[PDB]
Symmetry: D2
Subunit: 300 residues, 4 copies
Amino acid sequence: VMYYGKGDVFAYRTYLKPLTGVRTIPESPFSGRDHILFGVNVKISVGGTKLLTSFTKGDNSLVVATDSMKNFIQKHLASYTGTTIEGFLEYVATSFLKKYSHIEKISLIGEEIPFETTFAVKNGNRAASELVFKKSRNEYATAYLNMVRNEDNTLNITEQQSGLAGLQLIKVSGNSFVGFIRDEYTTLPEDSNRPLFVYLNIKWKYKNTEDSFGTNPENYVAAEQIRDIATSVFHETETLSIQHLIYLIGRRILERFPQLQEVYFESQNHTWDKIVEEIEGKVYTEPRPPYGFQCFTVTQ
Amino acid sequence: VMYYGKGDVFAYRTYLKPLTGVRTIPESPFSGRDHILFGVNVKISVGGTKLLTSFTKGDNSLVVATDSMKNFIQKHLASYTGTTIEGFLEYVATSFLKKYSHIEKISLIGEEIPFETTFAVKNGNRAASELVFKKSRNEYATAYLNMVRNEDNTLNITEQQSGLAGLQLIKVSGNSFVGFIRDEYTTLPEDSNRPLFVYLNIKWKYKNTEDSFGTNPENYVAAEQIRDIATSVFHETETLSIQHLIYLIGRRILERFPQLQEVYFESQNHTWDKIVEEIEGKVYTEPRPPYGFQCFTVTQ
Amino acid sequence: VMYYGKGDVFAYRTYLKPLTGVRTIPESPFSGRDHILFGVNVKISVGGTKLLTSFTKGDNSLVVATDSMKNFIQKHLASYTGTTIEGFLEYVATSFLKKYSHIEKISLIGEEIPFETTFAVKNGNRAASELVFKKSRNEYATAYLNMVRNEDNTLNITEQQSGLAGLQLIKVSGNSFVGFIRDEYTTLPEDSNRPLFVYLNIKWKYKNTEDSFGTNPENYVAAEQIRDIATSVFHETETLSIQHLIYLIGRRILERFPQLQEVYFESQNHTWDKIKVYTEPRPPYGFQCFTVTQ
Amino acid sequence: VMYYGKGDVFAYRTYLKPLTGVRTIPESPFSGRDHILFGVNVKISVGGTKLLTSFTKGDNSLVVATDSMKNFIQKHLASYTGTTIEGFLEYVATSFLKKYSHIEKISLIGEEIPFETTFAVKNGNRAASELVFKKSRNEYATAYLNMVRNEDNTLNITEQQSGLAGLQLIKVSGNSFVGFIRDEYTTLPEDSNRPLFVYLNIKWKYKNTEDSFGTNPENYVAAEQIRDIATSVFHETETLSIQHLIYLIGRRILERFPQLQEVYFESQNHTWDKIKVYTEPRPPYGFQCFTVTQ
Ligand SMILES: O=c1[nH]c(=O)c2nn[nH]c2[nH]1
Ligand SMILES: O=c1[nH]c(=O)c2nn[nH]c2[nH]1
Ligand SMILES: O=c1[nH]c(=O)c2nn[nH]c2[nH]1
Ligand SMILES: O=c1[nH]c(=O)c2nn[nH]c2[nH]1
Ligand SMILES: [K+]
Ligand SMILES: [K+]
């Protein structure tokens, strides 16, 4: 392996081109993004056989400084005319490989920095502010893009993924976990009504990469819509495990978005413990640190 | 000094008594709390001259185990019949001092664990879920209560404060910081239009402690309403500094809530830097770690 | 209340004047600091009645920008000729009030950024490097200073404290917690041999503020020495509670350092649960606050 | 993909069998581990075709609860008779696949929880305590193991790696970064003497998996020794980049440990900005990934 790059390249700008013309689904009122305030955190990693002597000899002749990669990313947000985080990564990647022809591969991760609308009273009228936004530390959209320059000097995307990260959902009732193996290592009691608390990271892969860029926005799959499917499916279903929940969420995603090839889940179990004192309302509290987790792919 | 206690006592319960009958203000649509899902993180600290030998001699005869304080808090959330985090602390404090008459002082901090409504589709109807909630890592309500047992064995509250913590607001334009001292230590340029990013922690003190408990809920001041004043005032005003912004927020709070005696601000400045590369849309990025801060009290 | 300032002002300096000639105590090998690499994280807060209109009117005419406070701190680490973090805060505070006559009060917190030595081979000899250091995220020295300008324009120290923060100590045996109140709320079993795991913040106040500056280094009390007293006392004693442990640590500190007026403790209990094998507990943690005076 | 498991399974054990008889190298004093106190944080992941219906139908009949995996790990630390974190993972993996025939693959990550010795006075003599240890939040040993059940029911190790994580090293001088591309996007000045601050994660693979278990301790490679090689090489060399530094560290590791097949580096650049006085940079950090093979 031989890669180098820059992480935590934050970039914020106002008045990105709005995302509109999206295709709606029953589970979500999402209708687009006004993009008055946009933020992204980018990680860039590059490689190429011509970088060998920067490691073996200390020869920096062909090294793009990682500080310069930071400048490159931030400058390209200023000139980006598109509407999605996926399209921004494609713009950066194509531009970078065209600039530096000795680079054979670039990998980009983009994580949206989400902001929420606030309201203000102007002359007796309370209405959405175009100026003041709340920074959110909750869920956010993500994107991943890898691109190569082939031996014949043509350029190709080699992996593209979109995602939703940081979603934390608790369902207070309507969840069971029963019927699991009870042997000499089992101290977990059967529970026909637990308050299941799941962390969800969800990623999806398009059949056609062009659909990820917003160029024809009716074919875009928004992380907001995926989020809203997840919350609806969790509500609708008596869950039998996190495994079965994420299967059902994935099936619903692929049914709603036939342009997707597959969907990938990383879930964690953070369910609260019943308190020690006997019960009045039932009371729960934080568990010990060990957390369950699941990784699962659903394909068309 | 001589105190001991328990921190990070989390307690979650469903169907706390709803908060309704609140008094509205122009800046906020807040109309109450449904309390289907309630969470709080409590810190308890106690003291008393009779605890001396637990330090000086290792005699635990009069020590309430901190684990037992945790049990006490969690059990009392199960039996609490009120509607506010302030009233919950009062219930815990009065009950604890009545149980343990050798304790002379108790200090409680409560931090709400906020949850946000989600939506689900049931038989074609998309509507607020009573089951699935999103855990929020954004702003949250707080409460502080100190109570003593006097030498004559009567009980009194000795300090009570309510608050809002973790509010992060960015205003993209309509902020200036000019006219400050320019001397041999000054490298900051004058800026007539900066994207001011402030962290706000806001605390308030009632004239009459009973108004904090929800018993007559029209006299309650909700952290939600304080939040909404802060966002409105930030929008309405060309800011001249964070100092002047928090003064104006405080004045508006005290005007809207004449039952409050004073309001206290802890603010931090986290404003982004303009990027190094020249500009296309202007682009900003994260600053170096040093952050400005302000502490300020406004009184009636 | 009316204060403003800057937090997280980091400053890293090479070749500060070495701290030497400190009095060594039996609990600790500490005998000074080479100061090849010295880092500090400073928080500055200032106030004064003449700042009122910066809040009430948006008038910045008397505002020292917090960014300029950051520059002031960093520049003064470059010019500081002393040997201790306490002396550095004194230098910053005096310098700042002398520079800005409208400031009536300044409060400073300094946290040392600790570095540890590393091994290098030089001509076959393994020894501590003079060039390569390891950044530590464990315990660290602290200092606190509040200074005011009086109406007669004299400057006065109103608060001064030194400290050790972030010390995490576990003793595998020789600890009990028994005899506490058992009632309707008690589920904790009595335990005659627990692996007590304590977090310790320890603060001390000098009888004579001059002793904190290193001017006469025989009178300086190093956070390293306080750490080593804490571990020695923890080892020596069959503990009966965290309360009684911190009492005994504090008594030893005051006995070893008669120039100290008081010691202050903030402890937390992070003892593992028994499943011998132990594991991490649930989040609630016990804590204690306690002062011993000379 | 179809896996599930448990993360953050902490387990703390006293008096593990000591690691002794290790081969010492010139860069490091390391000569074993007393193992009075031993902590590990384990992540377990398992899979198998027979788990399909636990996802597709909600049938838990073949689900080992992740809580039970936690119990399994913790109990096996109590019964483990070996001397290394790599050997502990092997014991857990073999034991788990032998217990649960429907599991076809298991992946384990183990992170050592590092403790440091402390000073105590015993009858006037200051010495390392056998009872009181300091919890360290600095660098730590790691191990990784993947094991599968074949169709003929043999068990096979498919991946195995050891590591050192969280090493943070700053070298005050003797580092350059010059000669890189300067174009429209370059604002970074050339620097002939920077205080290079690197974070290092270092991983290695043995030629013979048996060497990782400590069974023959002369062949074990301790994370402590890798750390000390890293600091020695950093010291010895006028660095020309992080890229070239990690190349030289890796070459020295493979020379000192011919039983190793490869070394892998994940480095990050956290060098301070110059305001001599330096300060913390803005958040963006450089990083490098690089493998050296024997
Ligand atoms: O949903 C769950 N899946 C699991 O595998 C599991 N194991 N313990 N609890 C659990 N809950
Ligand atoms: O609003 C501000 N107040 C201040 O005191 C300050 N100092 N630098 N920038 C600043 N901005
Ligand atoms: O040392 C202790 N002090 C306490 O107050 C306490 N309470 N529970 N466990 C405890 N341990
Ligand atoms: O060691 C370095 N390698 C790099 O690639 C680099 N880029 N900017 N600074 C750097 N330093
Ligand atoms: K719309
Ligand atoms: K209502």
